[PDB]
Design an enzyme around this catalytic site. Structure first.
Site, short mmCIF file in Angstrom:
data_model
loop_
_atom_site.label_atom_id
_atom_site.label_comp_id
_atom_site.label_asym_id
_atom_site.label_seq_id
_atom_site.Cartn_x
_atom_site.Cartn_y
_atom_site.Cartn_z
CB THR A 59 111.62 35.26 -17.31
OG1 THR A 59 111.97 36.59 -16.89
CG2 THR A 59 111.50 35.23 -18.85
CE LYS A 141 114.93 38.42 -20.06
NZ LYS A 141 114.37 38.25 -18.71
NE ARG A 143 114.70 33.57 -18.79
CZ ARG A 143 115.96 33.98 -18.73
NH1 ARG A 143 116.92 33.28 -19.31
NH2 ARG A 143 116.27 35.12 -18.10
ZN LIG Z 1 110.70 38.05 -16.95
ZN LIG Z 2 113.70 39.42 -14.59
#
Ligand SMILES: [Zn+2]
Ligand SMILES: [Zn+2]
Ligand SMILES: [Ca+2]
Length: 530
Positions: A59, A141, A143
């Protein structure tokens, strides 16, 4: 009315990353879209074979490419976590989006930060050219939000827990954010009865056992207050899109003289794919809800009269759990040997190197970057390298192992990403001060989650193979001319392709990507510096 996507500069760039939205998954369900994804595939510039071209198909590296024009070898974001064995603090594992210099921090309790990101984002470059630019990034998320927004973003928000959306330390919620979080809290406090199956999901409705878990038939029913359930469901994508639409309106993004940008990281598809695999009712429902909610989101922006251009892509692809593959004509699919996981691998290598019981290597999964312990003498380091290579190369599930030096000596790759070598892929997420002493690659169709009596995630990405690299890249603006371009392109191409639309020059030697012409036929949106 028909209108070139390059006729005039758009007033708003909307960049959407759908976490783990693989080209495999996107293509499977393409024929059932009727909402936002139908708009993009039927009207847009469609690159169904885009590439997160590097080996480290996680990710953080993936999000670091989308709005930087830069591969992880240049962003420095070479994994979700890397070791810094020279770190001052006791925890040598560093999170991709923390500032480890903060006192009392660890990779488990960190301070969110874009500090690790070595390059500017598109919003940073727009802001350097025009200070009036607003740069906004919201995601499920931290990040994702952080790596798409960059260090000079105006607003960076991510889902932080049952408290709702939060930002960096010191950043108080605005009136908008508290309203969003109040709405969130009210949704969480209500039970969700789940979703009946869309037609296309009916065929996926059968159970598959993996260790102690059963997957395949979930419909996102969930108890009131069940935050885990909320997080692993379409509910968080709906919230994130609602948050984005409200931010756009409240800040009047796209309604001023200059071009603004907002990045949106829709995380649900990834949590769903990890928890359930990718071919059951859960992903099927999620993707159908994604199409619907994107449609509602684009409709709101249209109603607002905003001249926006969209790019939608993914941070990486994905791969179904082996247990269901073996039911569906892939009997060779299998889980990685528990012997290759970090504790067992280190114990094996230490023993073969004549150092039983000692800590000789550091790693955090059964593939990827491996680091030699700094307390090794030069001779011991040499034995550890020799035995690690010998043992891993003889293991039946291992494709290959590269040394740091072999990757370093590889030129930055160019040419069609769909036919790169494995070491070209490795080179594209190689960053000398952060990369391992060895890079371990598993054979195709080996899932890097071992079989266990008690399991969590049943499936993951992170491999160097096509399922995990290949992602759609879709561009759209009202009235443009659709085309389909099936040859491979890279997500690093996205920044120069958008920059051309707003006539923003981007020095070619500062990025890895190239401009993609978004104008079908004769005329060329890239004409100019790019
Ligand atoms: Zn991801
Ligand atoms: Zn993932
Ligand atoms: Ca053209």
């Amino acid at each position: 009315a028909a209108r070139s996507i390059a006729a005039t500069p758009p007033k708003l760039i909307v960049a959407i990353s759908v976490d783990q939205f693989s080209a495999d998954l996107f293509s499977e369900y393409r024929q059932y879209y009727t909402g936002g994804l139908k708009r993009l595939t039927s009207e847009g510039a469609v690159f169904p074979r885009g590439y997160q071209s590097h080996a480290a198909t996680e990710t953080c590296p993936g999000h670091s490419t989308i709005l930087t024009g830069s591969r992880p070898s240049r962003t420095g974001i070479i994994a979700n976590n890397w070791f810094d064995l020279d770190a001052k603090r006791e925890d040598k594992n560093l999170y991709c989006a923390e500032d480890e210099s903060q006192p009392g921090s660890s990779s488990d309790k960190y301070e969110a930060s874009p500090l690790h990101l070595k390059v500017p984002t598109l919003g940073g470059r727009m802001k350097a050219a025009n200070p009036a630019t607003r740069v906004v990034s919201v995601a499920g998320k931290d990040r994702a939000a952080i790596m798409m927004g960059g260090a000079t973003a105006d607003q960076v928000w991510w889902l932080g827990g049952p408290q709702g959306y939060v930002s960096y330390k010191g950043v108080a919620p605005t009136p908008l954010v508290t309203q969003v979080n109040q709405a969130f809290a009210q949704r969480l406090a209500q039970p969700n009865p789940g979703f009946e199956l869309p037609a296309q999901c009916v065929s996926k409705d059968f159970p598959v056992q993996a260790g102690n878990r059963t997957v395949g038939t979930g419909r996102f029913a969930r108890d009131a207050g069940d935050y885990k359930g909320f997080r692993i469901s379409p509910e968080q994508d709906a919230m994130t899109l609602a948050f984005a639409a409200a931010a756009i309106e409240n800040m009047q993004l796209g309604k001023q003289a200059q071009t603004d940008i907002i990045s949106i990281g829709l995380s649900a598809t990834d949590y769903v794919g990890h928890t359930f695999g990718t071919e059951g009712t859960e992903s099927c429902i999620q993707v159908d809800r994604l199409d619907t909610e994107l449609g509602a989101f684009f409709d709101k922006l249209d109603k607002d009269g905003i001249d926006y251009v969209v790019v939608l892509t993914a941070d990486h692809g994905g791969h179904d759990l082996p247990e269901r593959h073996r039911m569906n004509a892939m009997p060779m699919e299998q889980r990685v040997d528990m012997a290759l996981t970090p504790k067992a691998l280190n114990a094996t290598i230490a023993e073969k190197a004549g150092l039983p019981g000692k800590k000789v290597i550091w790693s955090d999964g059964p593939s990827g970057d491996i680091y030699y312990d700094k307390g090794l003498t030069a001779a011991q380091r040499a034995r550890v390298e020799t035995e690690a290579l010998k043992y891993l190369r003889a293991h039946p599930q291992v494709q290959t192992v590269f040394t740091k030096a072999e990757i370093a000596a590889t030129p930055s790759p160019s040419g069609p990403p769909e036919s790169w070598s494995l070491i070209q892929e490795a080179r594209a997420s190689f960053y000398p001060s952060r990369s391992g002493d060895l890079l371990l690659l598993l054979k195709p169709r080996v899932m890097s989650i071992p079989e266990q009596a008690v399991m969590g995630s049943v499936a993951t990405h992170g491999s160097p193979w096509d399922t995990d690299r290949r992602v759609p890249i879709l561009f759209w603006r009202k009235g443009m001319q659709h085309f389909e371009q099936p040859l491979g392109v890279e997500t690093v191409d996205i920044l120069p392709s958008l920059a051309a639309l707003i006539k923003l020059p981007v020095p070619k030697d500062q990025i890895d990507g190239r401009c993609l012409d978004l104008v079908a036929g004769k005329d060329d949106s890239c004409a100019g510096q790019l």
